[PDB]
Amino acid sequence: GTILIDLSPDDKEFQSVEEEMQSTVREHRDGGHAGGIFNRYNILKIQKVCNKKLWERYTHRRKEVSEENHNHANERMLFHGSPFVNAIIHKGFDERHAYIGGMFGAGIYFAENSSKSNQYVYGIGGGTGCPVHKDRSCYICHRQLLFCRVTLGKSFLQFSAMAHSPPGHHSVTGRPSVNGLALAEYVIYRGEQAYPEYLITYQIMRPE
Numbered sequence: 001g002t003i004l005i006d007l008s009p010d011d012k013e014f015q016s017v018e019e020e021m022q023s024t025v026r027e028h029r030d031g032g033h034a035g036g037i038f039n040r041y042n043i044l045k046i047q048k049v050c051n052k053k054l055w056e057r058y059t060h061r062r063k064e065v066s067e068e069n070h071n072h073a074n075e076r077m078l079f080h081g082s083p084f085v086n087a088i089i090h091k092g093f094d095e096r097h098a099y100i101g102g103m104f105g106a107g108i109y110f111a112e113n114s115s116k117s118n119q120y121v122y123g124i125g126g127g128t129g130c131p132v133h134k135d136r137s138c139y140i141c142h143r144q145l146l147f148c149r150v151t152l153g154k155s156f157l158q159f160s161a162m163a164h165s166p167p168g169h170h171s172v173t174g175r176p177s178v179n180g181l182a183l184a185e186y187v188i189y190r191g192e193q194a195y196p197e198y199l200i201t202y203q204i205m206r207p208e
């Protein structure tokens with residue numbers, strides 16, 4: 001039941017999503033190994049993901065979490081990169097979309113930095129790169145990321161360099177404790193706590 005609606009580049013909604021994508025690029029400690037070498041993107045398309053059943057699943061869980069946390073869902077808009085982007089937009093997030101070996105346990109991981117999520121587009125560690133050229137820094141092939149509505153509720157704070165949430169919590173927050181420029185990363189342990197609201201198609205751009 002998913003339909004994708006193209007946003008016009010003239011639409012304020014396109015423009016605000018693009019700005020969040022571009023403005024949250026950073027350099028990575030791997031020198032570009034996983035995600036490629038770039039400072040910015042060429043945004044090719046932004047689509048709204050519309051699915052009534054998946055939305056209702058999200059808002060149902062959101063209300064449950066809100067009621068467990070003094071009427072505060074603690075909702076964020078966060079990036080998600082995954083080889084399973086097509087399955088997610090049609091079927092919703094679930095246990096098959098978890099990062100089993102993640103540092104905060106087996107859960108579904110999201111990032112404030114779009115460039116962190118870009119590292120996962122072709123798999124963990126960038127896998128073998130793009131299917132066509134086997135290049136993790138491919139400047140030709142089209143990539144996709146999701147910009148997602150995520151319910152954090154009461155989040156367990158981990159200071160740092162599917163499973164269950166820690167008791168009495170609805171998510172985990174990975175706070176960077178070494179790299180002063182890194183933004184936070186987040187993990188949820190229930191697929192119903194995220195909705196894949198925007199599908200963004202893009203290329204990474206070669207620095208000049």
Ligand SMILES: COc1ccc(-c2nc3ccccc3c(=O)[nH]2)cc1
Pocket residue numbers: 079080081082083097098099100109110111116117118120123124185186
């Ligand atoms: C095996 O399938 C996987 C594995 C890892 C990820 C993933 N991990 C992240 C970790 C930190 C921040 C963002 C992300 C992120 O956006 N995606 C997605 C699918």
Ligand SMILES: [Zn+2]
Pocket residue numbers: 130131132133134135138139140141
């Ligand atoms: Zn390629």
